[PDB]
Design an enzyme around this catalytic site. Sequence first.
Site, PDB file in Angstrom:
ATOM      1  N   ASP A 227      -5.717   5.736 -10.131  1.00 31.35           N
ATOM      2  CA  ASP A 227      -6.477   6.141 -10.047  1.00 31.35           C
ATOM      3  C   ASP A 227      -7.102   4.813  -9.418  1.00 31.35           C
ATOM      4  O   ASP A 227      -7.993   4.711  -8.635  1.00 31.35           O
ATOM      5  CB  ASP A 227      -7.127   7.504  -9.799  1.00 31.35           C
ATOM      6  CG  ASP A 227      -6.957   8.725  -9.640  1.00 31.35           C
ATOM      7  OD1 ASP A 227      -5.570   8.785  -8.890  1.00 31.35           O
ATOM      8  OD2 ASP A 227      -7.065   9.520  -9.729  1.00 31.35           O
TER       9      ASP A 227
ATOM     10  N   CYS B  99       0.533   2.112   1.187  1.00 31.86           N
ATOM     11  CA  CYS B  99       0.569   2.987  -0.287  1.00 31.86           C
ATOM     12  C   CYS B  99      -1.072   3.832   0.885  1.00 31.86           C
ATOM     13  O   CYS B  99      -0.568   4.609   2.093  1.00 31.86           O
ATOM     14  CB  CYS B  99      -0.249   2.045  -0.607  1.00 31.86           C
ATOM     15  SG  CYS B  99      -1.524   0.523  -0.125  1.00 31.86           S
ATOM     16  N   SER B 100      -2.392   4.032   0.962  1.00 31.49           N
ATOM     17  CA  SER B 100      -3.141   4.432   1.666  1.00 31.49           C
ATOM     18  C   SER B 100      -3.193   3.801   2.607  1.00 31.49           C
ATOM     19  O   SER B 100      -3.233   5.027   4.088  1.00 31.49           O
ATOM     20  CB  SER B 100      -4.452   5.149   1.311  1.00 31.49           C
ATOM     21  OG  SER B 100      -5.178   5.914   2.008  1.00 31.49           O
ATOM     22  N   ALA B 101      -4.323   2.443   3.172  1.00 30.59           N
ATOM     23  CA  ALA B 101      -4.575   1.795   3.772  1.00 30.59           C
ATOM     24  C   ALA B 101      -3.027   0.672   4.294  1.00 30.59           C
ATOM     25  O   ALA B 101      -3.107   0.079   5.073  1.00 30.59           O
ATOM     26  CB  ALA B 101      -5.849   0.900   3.503  1.00 30.59           C
ATOM     27  N   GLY B 102      -2.466   0.279   3.849  1.00 25.17           N
ATOM     28  CA  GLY B 102      -1.264   0.149   3.740  1.00 25.17           C
ATOM     29  C   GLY B 102      -1.543  -2.160   3.446  1.00 25.17           C
ATOM     30  O   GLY B 102      -0.433  -2.534   4.014  1.00 25.17           O
ATOM     31  N   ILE B 103      -2.514  -2.627   2.961  1.00 22.80           N
ATOM     32  CA  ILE B 103      -2.826  -3.446   2.266  1.00 22.80           C
ATOM     33  C   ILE B 103      -3.230  -3.805   1.212  1.00 22.80           C
ATOM     34  O   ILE B 103      -3.131  -5.122   0.912  1.00 22.80           O
ATOM     35  CB  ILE B 103      -4.203  -3.395   2.917  1.00 22.80           C
ATOM     36  CG1 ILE B 103      -4.959  -3.058   2.907  1.00 22.80           C
ATOM     37  CG2 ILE B 103      -4.167  -3.759   4.535  1.00 22.80           C
ATOM     38  CD1 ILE B 103      -6.490  -3.313   3.221  1.00 22.80           C
ATOM     39  N   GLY B 104      -3.657  -2.630   0.019  1.00 26.09           N
ATOM     40  CA  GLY B 104      -3.745  -3.281  -1.277  1.00 26.09           C
ATOM     41  C   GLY B 104      -2.434  -3.253  -2.709  1.00 26.09           C
ATOM     42  O   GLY B 104      -1.633  -4.517  -2.598  1.00 26.09           O
ATOM     43  N   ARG B 105      -2.074  -2.017  -2.575  1.00 23.67           N
ATOM     44  CA  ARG B 105      -1.180  -2.180  -3.250  1.00 23.67           C
ATOM     45  C   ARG B 105       0.533  -2.563  -2.415  1.00 23.67           C
ATOM     46  O   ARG B 105       1.042  -3.520  -3.052  1.00 23.67           O
ATOM     47  CB  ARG B 105      -0.985  -0.984  -3.557  1.00 23.67           C
ATOM     48  CG  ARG B 105      -1.771   0.207  -4.840  1.00 23.67           C
ATOM     49  CD  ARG B 105      -1.976   1.509  -5.058  1.00 23.67           C
ATOM     50  NE  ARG B 105      -2.562   2.267  -5.366  1.00 23.67           N
ATOM     51  CZ  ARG B 105      -3.007   3.408  -5.883  1.00 23.67           C
ATOM     52  NH1 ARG B 105      -1.691   4.207  -5.625  1.00 23.67           N
ATOM     53  NH2 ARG B 105      -4.314   3.808  -6.341  1.00 23.67           N
ATOM     54  N   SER B 106       0.219  -2.648  -1.196  1.00 27.73           N
ATOM     55  CA  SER B 106       1.401  -2.605  -0.124  1.00 27.73           C
ATOM     56  C   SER B 106       1.922  -4.440  -0.277  1.00 27.73           C
ATOM     57  O   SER B 106       2.591  -5.203  -0.719  1.00 27.73           O
ATOM     58  CB  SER B 106       1.219  -1.915   0.742  1.00 27.73           C
ATOM     59  OG  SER B 106       1.230  -1.194   0.864  1.00 27.73           O
TER      60      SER B 106
ATOM     61  N   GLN C 103      -6.872  -6.805  -2.302  1.00 32.67           N
ATOM     62  CA  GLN C 103      -8.289  -6.380  -1.673  1.00 32.67           C
ATOM     63  C   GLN C 103      -9.558  -5.689  -2.701  1.00 32.67           C
ATOM     64  O   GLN C 103     -10.998  -5.582  -2.067  1.00 32.67           O
ATOM     65  CB  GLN C 103      -8.023  -4.298  -1.239  1.00 32.67           C
ATOM     66  CG  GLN C 103      -7.652  -3.702  -0.435  1.00 32.67           C
ATOM     67  CD  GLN C 103      -7.637  -2.265  -0.199  1.00 32.67           C
ATOM     68  OE1 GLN C 103      -6.825  -1.474  -0.419  1.00 32.67           O
ATOM     69  NE2 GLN C 103      -8.425  -1.815   0.889  1.00 32.67           N
TER      70      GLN C 103
END
Length: 282
Positions: free
Chosen positions: A181, A215-222, A262
């Site tokens: 998390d 992912c949620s925003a599509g920039i960090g984990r992605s 991010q």
Amino acid sequence: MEMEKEFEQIDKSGSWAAIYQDIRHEASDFPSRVAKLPKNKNRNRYRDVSPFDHSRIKLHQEDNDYINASLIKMEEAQRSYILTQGPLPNTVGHFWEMVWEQKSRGVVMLNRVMEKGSLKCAQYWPQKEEKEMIFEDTNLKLTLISEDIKSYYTVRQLELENLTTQETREILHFHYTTWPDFGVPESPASFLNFLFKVRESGSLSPEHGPVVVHCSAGIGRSGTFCLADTCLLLMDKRKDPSSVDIKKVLLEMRKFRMGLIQTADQLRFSYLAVIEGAKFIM
Ligand SMILES: COCC(=O)N[C@H](C)c1ccccc1
């Protein structure tokens, strides 16, 4: 510099935040005018994460062709990826329309539906074989065929049917379920094992459309996922693998979508994953 020793040099000097801010300062800035039209406000999860106009995925629709999704095309590595946000209640039908129209084989999901007590994306795939989903706005049907639950991730086989033509396709859903998390994983080992499972499926290969990753925003984990994949592929292709410069690859990818990676902790984790992964390849 090489990667592994540039790595130790940033750790010993404690300068990850300054390296990461340099990337942010040098990143491309391109217009995202379609994303900001008023008619698209409920198609965006976050007001500060938008696809550039030049690289956005268009839905094959004349009314409104907008979805928050970007095509990242890596020319030397010969890989393409579609990075998108976690679907919203009013965009789940658009999401599967994109999967269909772009001929994707696989979907890669790097978040849980609920994290930190809040909803991070819609429940956009069916959970029981006998309870299929119908998306009436885009005329698609989606069925769960099988599910294989492992300790760090789950793979699902899905059938997507275009109800207009009665054509059907098999979609693979690769769901990484254990990203914490807060922060990043302590070891990259399970993330790398997950990447290799996606590769082995054929979902990243040129005989299919681009993989869809979110992912949620599509920039960090992605961003971490496609950056690691591309860097490892370049280390296999080139005569001199130590010439692969992860910061330069990241800036190339940021020409196609804003904000990839991010935090400075995500940047460090990406280095770690490429470094460990390069040893296992050989
Ligand atoms: C027991 O399934 C192992 C396994 O990998 N299953 C996954 C869900 C799968 C992959 C490819 C085709 C069908 C299913």
